[PDB]
Amino acid sequence: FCKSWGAEYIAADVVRFRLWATGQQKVMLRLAGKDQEMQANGDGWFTLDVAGVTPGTEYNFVLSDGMVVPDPASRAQKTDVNGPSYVVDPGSYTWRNTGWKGSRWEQAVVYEMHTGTFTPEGTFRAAIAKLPYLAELGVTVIEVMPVAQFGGERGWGYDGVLLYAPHSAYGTPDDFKAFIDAAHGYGLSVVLDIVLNHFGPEGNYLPLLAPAFFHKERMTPWGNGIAYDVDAVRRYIIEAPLYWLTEYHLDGLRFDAIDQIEDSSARHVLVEIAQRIREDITDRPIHLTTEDSRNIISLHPRDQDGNAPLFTAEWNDDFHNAVHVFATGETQAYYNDFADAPEKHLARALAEGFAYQGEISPQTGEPRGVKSTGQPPVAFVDFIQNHDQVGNRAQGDRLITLAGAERTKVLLATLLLSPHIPLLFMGEEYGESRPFLFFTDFHGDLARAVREGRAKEFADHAGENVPDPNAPETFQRSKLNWKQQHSEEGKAWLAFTRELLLLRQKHIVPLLSAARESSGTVLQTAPGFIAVSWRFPGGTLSLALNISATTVLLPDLPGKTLFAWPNESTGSLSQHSLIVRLAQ
Numbered sequence: 001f002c003k004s005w006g007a008e009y010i011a012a013d014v015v016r017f018r019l020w021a022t023g024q025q026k027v028m029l030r031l032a033g034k035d036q037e038m039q040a041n042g043d044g045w046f047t048l049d050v051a052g053v054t055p056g057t058e059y060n061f062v063l064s065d066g067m068v069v070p071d072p073a074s075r076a077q078k079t080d081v082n083g084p085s086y087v088v089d090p091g092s093y094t095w096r097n098t099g100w101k102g103s104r105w106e107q108a109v110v111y112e113m114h115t116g117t118f119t120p121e122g123t124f125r126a127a128i129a130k131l132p133y134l135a136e137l138g139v140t141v142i143e144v145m146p147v148a149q150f151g152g153e154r155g156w157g158y159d160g161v162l163l164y165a166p167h168s169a170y171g172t173p174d175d176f177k178a179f180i181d182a183a184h185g186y187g188l189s190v191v192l193d194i195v196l197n198h199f200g201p202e203g204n205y206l207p208l209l210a211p212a213f214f215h216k217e218r219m220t221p222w223g224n225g226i227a228y229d230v231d232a233v234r235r236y237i238i239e240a241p242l243y244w245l246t247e248y249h250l251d252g253l254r255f256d257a258i259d260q261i262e263d264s265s266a267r268h269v270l271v272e273i274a275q276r277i278r279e280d281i282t283d284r285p286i287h288l289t290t291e292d293s294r295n296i297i298s299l300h301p302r303d304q305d306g307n308a309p310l311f312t313a314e315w316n317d318d319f320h321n322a323v324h325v326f327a328t329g330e331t332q333a334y335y336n337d338f339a340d341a342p343e344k345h346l347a348r349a350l351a352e353g354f355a356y357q358g359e360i361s362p363q364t365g366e367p368r369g370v371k372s373t374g375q376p377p378v379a380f381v382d383f384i385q386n387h388d389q390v391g392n393r394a395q396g397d398r399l400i401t402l403a404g405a406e407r408t409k410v411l412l413a414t415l416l417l418s419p420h421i422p423l424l425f426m427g428e429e430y431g432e433s434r435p436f437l438f439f440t441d442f443h444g445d446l447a448r449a450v451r452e453g454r455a456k457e458f459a460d461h462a463g464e465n466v467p468d469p470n471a472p473e474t475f476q477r478s479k480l481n482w483k484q485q486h487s488e489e490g491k492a493w494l495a496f497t498r499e500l501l502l503l504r505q506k507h508i509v510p511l512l513s514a515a516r517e518s519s520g521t522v523l524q525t526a527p528g529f530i531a532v533s534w535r536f537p538g539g540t541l542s543l544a545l546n547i548s549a550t551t552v553l554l555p556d557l558p559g560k561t562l563f564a565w566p567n568e569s570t571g572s573l574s575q576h577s578l579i580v581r582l583a584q
């Protein structure tokens with residue numbers, strides 16, 4: 001992929017190095033230790049063409065004063081975020097599965113994976129050995145947490161600063177391509193979590209190169225707001241997703257915190273990103289998902305034939321959040337919006353998409369959301385676990401530890417047989433109980449600021465003892481336990497998950513393509529009990545769930561029984577049970 005920023009081959013034997021640095025009068029290129037002056041070619045841009053440069057050659061930029069910095073648009077770092085960048089050959093990796101052309105979004109079952117903790121080794125190469133396992137299980141889309149190089153050698157990925165460079169701790173560019181290529185061969189699409197709303201705190205020299213890269217007033221909760229209205233900035237931001245998709249042959253992207261991407265440009269940066277992706281990549285579906293707290297739908301339209309010209313689906317945190325209150329009784333902070341009749345919110349989310357479609361949010365005191373019933377069910381990504389819902393907790397508790405195994409089983413089945421697109425957090429499939437903690441790898445003042453900034457999020461829970469994010473044990477405690485995965489109890493969870501996914505592809509997925517609207521109805525709710533129906537062209541799907549300690553009577557649920565757990569009862573649902581039916 002060809003980019004405005006960075007180091008690219010412009011001929012078989014010539015690399016063009018390009019940097020925008022409005023805060024600088026001059027910039028030098030330090031190439032394999034030797035300094036050459038770059039040409040200032042208007043509007044703060046500096047450029048230099050160098051003949052003969054081989055792939056793997058190290059380089060840095062040197063500022064007017066003598067400060068040595070990584071390429072902010074580095075394609076790869078030699079070691080850490082502050083060290084040399086290196087010239088990458090886009091063609092060094094030989095793609096084997098070039099006939100892959102993806103799969104329809106309707107069959108998506110997403111599996112969110114953190115590269116560093118997914119395996120003991122914590123690398124892309126080690127993760128390849130687990131791909132057959134995931135494919136066998138019935139996962140169809142791997143979502144890789146952000147790989148943009150960040151400070152230190154451990155982190156979730158949201159402190160990324162070199163937005164074009166996969167973290168050297170995970171592997172080289174070719175290691176990541178090998179993982180993607182292998183995934184394709186195993187029948188898995190791969191999407192990447194991408195952060196375009198802020199830069200992390202270590203290794204970001206853009207403020208020193210070009211203060212205008214960031215706004216003077218605007219600040220997100222995690223760093224300065226980005227000046228998307230400035231042409232050079234817009235090039236850096238928009239070309240990043242295009243680069244990842246083209247150069248890494250990815251199947252989509254998940255955009256972090258889009259509600260924190262403020263742009264007053266006539267054409268919003270996110271709209272332009274989506275439009276360019278749909279015009280530039282046409283040989284395969286590209287599944288663009290977004291994380292937005294606003295419960296809008298304007299970025300997820302469908303045309304009459306069901307195509308998504310902008311974004312494909314939206315993270316529907318209302319589902320998780322209603323489930324969490326419903327199943328655990330916790331009502332603090334953002335969960336308080338679901339404290340009143342969580343069953344009603346849950347049923348509404350299942351049936352219609354959003355629980356909040358314009359009603360006042362208790363937590364904000366403002367209207368939240370818009371009508372969502374006209375969206376197809378596949379425009380929502382639902383989940384009972386993800387990196388945030390687990391990791392934003394002081395002790396990183398997984399749902400199974402809060403709701404218990406029996407309740408978690410019926411919630412997992414609910415998720416997997418529902419018409420919304422399901423996302424699983426790595427480890428759920430075998431009943432993992434290890435926490436997923438917030439971990440980092442910083443030093444000095446930054447380490448202290450991050451550690452105390454984290455503790456302060458839980459200061460009102462006085463009694464808490466938040467694990468130091470910088471401590472290696474915080475990271476080690478979060479590693480998936482593959483022993484458990486191989487255990488008998490783990491094999492029971494795996495068998496449960498596997499059957500659910502088979503049932504999903506056999507019975508649910510075929511209903512989804514023709515569904516142009518929610519088509520969902522709440523039949524009944526009561527404390528601990530929901531019953532919902534979806535009327536699709538291909539059949540009427542019904543679901544009822546009871547997590548109360550006593551049996552409940554059911555409405556009529558037409559059709560044959562797709563799944564009943566633990567048992568099926570006629571006209572009733574026992575404690576801690578679920579039933580799913582389909583009438584055709």
Ligand SMILES: [Cl-]
Pocket residue numbers: 103104105106285
């Ligand atoms: Cl599709």
Ligand SMILES: [Cl-]
Pocket residue numbers: 284285286287308
């Ligand atoms: Cl598409």
Ligand SMILES: [Cl-]
Pocket residue numbers: 292293294317318
């Ligand atoms: Cl949300």
Ligand SMILES: [Cl-]
Pocket residue numbers: 385398399400401408428
């Ligand atoms: Cl869980």
Ligand SMILES: [Mg+2]
Pocket residue numbers: 091092
């Ligand atoms: Mg070549």
Ligand SMILES: [Mg+2]
Pocket residue numbers: 138505
């Ligand atoms: Mg399959």
Ligand SMILES: [Mg+2]
Pocket residue numbers: 257293
């Ligand atoms: Mg958010």
Ligand SMILES: [Mg+2]
Pocket residue numbers: 290291292293294295314315316317
């Ligand atoms: Mg959302």
Ligand SMILES: [Mg+2]
Pocket residue numbers: 104305306307
């Ligand atoms: Mg389609």
Ligand SMILES: [Mg+2]
Pocket residue numbers: 365366367
């Ligand atoms: Mg108001």
